[PDB]
Design a binder for these strands. Structure first.
Lengths: 162, 176, 176, 161
DNA sequence: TAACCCTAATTCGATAGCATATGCTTCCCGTTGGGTAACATATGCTATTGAATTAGGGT
DNA sequence: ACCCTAATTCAATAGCATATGTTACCCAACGGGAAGCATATGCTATCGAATTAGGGTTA
């Protein structure tokens, strides 16, 4: 089972985005934190503009979700996107090409970082931990997404809670 | 005859019939990644391709690698979805992703910032483009059309995306 | 009511409408050069203003010479008149010539060429501006706007006009 | 009485816009314009068949403007003429607010479409000389060369029948 | 001797009627678009969990 | 030399939730049409009043 070793699931609240540090995610975050410690760089820009992004992709949803949870704990000064699936690539050699809407089962998640320098550092760290993983986690891949305009993440989220 | 056609022992807007039998969810067969070219979508596609014609550019790359892309965001889920469908019809040589929600941006001022895992209601959409030059042209066309369109559509914002090593989309398999 | 005057006129839901009465016909209190803001023209003006906003430029000059000009020809008289009225609302610092008819162009082949006095049905209106800088932006806005329009509006063609001497419009001293 | 007791044209002549004949008076005006334009010989319309040049005319009086237009047509059939129209009002002088863009004016105007800018300039100079020599409101007539960067595409269609 | 009439010629105004176009206004009806009830289709979140794999490690 | 025994780390593994895909209709806005009205050209005629000389005095 799960929560009770017998329930094997249920409604535990924790709505999408309500992630919490757990031994597994904390360990992943700890490893990523050590890799981030490798390079000393700022995370929050003065203008606080998310002009850089860490596009994680490939691997497996189980590996990606754990990496995403760990990345959040490892980097409090950043933003993460819910796992999404890449669209189909191209038909091999000759044959009918897939439609633009056509998407593959491959999952992915991009990490919004206001600074490009730290975005590069995070991408390197993610690769290091992903490579270290001997499980089907090394399959995970990441690419830098440089937003020239700079993705305008909603700079709200006030102390709305009473 | 989903409650709509004239007369009939049902419908509603035209003819007799109390109705109640209208757009009843039952799965339209088409799965995620495959959708029909709706007249509105192709109509939007016509405007997009018209603005694309304003700046004729290559629509594909010899490598075929989607190393370039564009980021669509803001506006509204319905508007973003309609734009995505129209973009697919207007730009056949592109790869589109299902609409997703952006994370919450930095909290205003020194106020406690949102966790690096929060999910803002803002929805975003990605367009993979092998040709970077076409990416800016497409974004400019989207901006011009969105600007000419009403405020809700005008709310939609688009910015070109650059992948450092590109995105290795999985090789598509032609169905048996 | 005022919008629907008559039991069965061409005004209103047309309920119990035998035909039409005091609907669109009638002599309004208006004259050439005398016009009022119209929501249709207002919406057109709003789009033009947004396109002009893309490149904010000088719209008036110290000399105020109407050396700058534009040639809005083609499309349909209805579309041309609507665009002209909207341009007036969008651009206060401008002068709109009454809609006129272009003459026929060279007759293709050796076919008898049309006379200079010969005038084609094609209608066109010219806009006077104090600075050409705004003229080009205005023309670009009009062209971009008509392109989005699937109506004959897209058929309308606009080319900036240049007056070396600069048309000397009569000073508006008459009022008071 | 269209010639006779009153001897003053009255009724429907059966003529239509563009049906301008070689009126001897207009032909004399055309003769003057012809002599003036004859001084500077230049192709009126090139093989491109593109009306990129224009000869905006205005000022003076509708009678003077129409007479000049009729003469211009007889003098130059290659060019294309436009029906007389009313210019819009100009900037309001003094602190008084300027008039609306729609606001027009009594001043009438007509532009001469030409494929050659050089000939368009020659036509302006010739018209100006004729306007100057005529001390009537014809002298009040004002003319300017309205060049078209793109080149107005006057419907290049053969007049059928 | 030039400077006068004068007195009609003159030629462009300044008139004389028709019947296309235009300008402002008004109803309107396609028209484009967002938007929403309803199957299927994705992941967030927790938790076990089990397992193939990574060793273990001194007998 | 390899035997249980960790073990382990994270995928997988459920039940919850939520968020998106692909389509049917409803109501949305907006701009080209249209109709009637002064409103004004084209063309041509004829016709007016300055011109525009014509000329013939006289000294």
């Amino acid at each position: 089972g799960d929560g009770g070793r017998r329930k094997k699931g249920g409604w535990f609240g924790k709505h999408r985005g309500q992630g919490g540090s757990n031994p597994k995610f904390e360990n992943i975050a700890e490893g990523l934190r050590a890799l981030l410690a490798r390079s000393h760089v700022e995370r929050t820009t003065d203008e606080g503009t998310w002009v850089a992004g860490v596009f994680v992709y490939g691997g497996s949803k189980t590996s990606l979700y754990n990496l995403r949870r760990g990345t959040a704990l490892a980097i409090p000064q950043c933003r993460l996107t819910p796992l999404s699936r890449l669209p189909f690539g191209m038909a091999p050699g000759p044959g009918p090409q897939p439609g633009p809407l056509r998407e593959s089962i491959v999952c992915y998640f991009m990490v919004f970082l206001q600074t490009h320098i730290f975005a590069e550092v995070l991408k390197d760290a993610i690769k290091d931990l992903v490579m270290t993983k001997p499980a089907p986690t090394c399959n995970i891949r990441v690419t830098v997404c440089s937003f020239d305009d700079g993705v305008d993440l909603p700079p709200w989220f006030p102390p709305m809670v009473e």
